[PDB]
Ligand binder design. Sequence first.
Ligand SMILES: *[C@@H]1O[C@H](CO)[C@@H](O[C@@H]2O[C@H](CO)[C@@H](O)[C@H](O)[C@H]2NC(C)=O)[C@H](O)[C@H]1NC(C)=O
Length: 227
Amino acid sequence: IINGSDCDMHTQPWQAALLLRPNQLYCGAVLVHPQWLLTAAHCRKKVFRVRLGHYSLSPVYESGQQMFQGVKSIPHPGYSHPGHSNDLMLIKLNRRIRPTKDVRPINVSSHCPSAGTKCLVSGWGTTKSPQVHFPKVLQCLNISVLSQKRCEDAYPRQIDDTMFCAGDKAGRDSCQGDSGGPVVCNGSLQGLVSWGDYPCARPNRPGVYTNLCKFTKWIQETIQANS
Ligand SMILES: *[C@@H]1O[C@H](CO)[C@@H](O[C@@H]2O[C@H](CO)[C@@H](O)[C@H](O)[C@H]2NC(C)=O)[C@H](O)[C@H]1NC(C)=O
């Protein structure tokens, strides 16, 4: 997260981290069900761990923290290795989470984001670009959703309906390491960190996020089919 601020503790109990042995923090994720997480399809990994209810980046032990393993990864069928469309995947945990103030799922909005909507994006991604600089704790940033029209101009022929652009303010944007992270608007999960221009935070170059409002049915059906 570039030019963001330290998140307030205990807020965002749905924020998840996808770790790789030993403790390589790759991609973020979001708890959307007692036993299901949501992340970008391009974050698919065969072996990995899931850390929830943890504020800092380092494996520093914390109370309220919970660890799990990915027992099943289901990327949306429409996700194409080259294109950024349908950039979402479902991850099932080995067990149901223990509901606490630090670990709590969030609902997926059925209504798509309209221009001007203010959203909150978070992640342990680099706070600088192109120079790498990881934060100490979860970073938070407010971003406003742009009109699909403007989204299309900034990224011609590559912007799609399964995605949306967010972030007008200068120097503020998501970056590498935040992928799969949550974009919350109106108290619900509206998107996921997907992609953007490089280096991050370039003026008139908003970040692109998966438009979750288009997959509510698939998400519910997939969860029910694997319950
Ligand atoms: C993101 O924007 C929201 C909306 O302005 C901020 O929420 C406010 O948070 C303060 C706490 O400092 C509350 O007193 C206000 O009531 C909140 N605003 C309202 C009316 O919802 C939030 O602080 C911002 N966070 C970041 C990271 O910028």
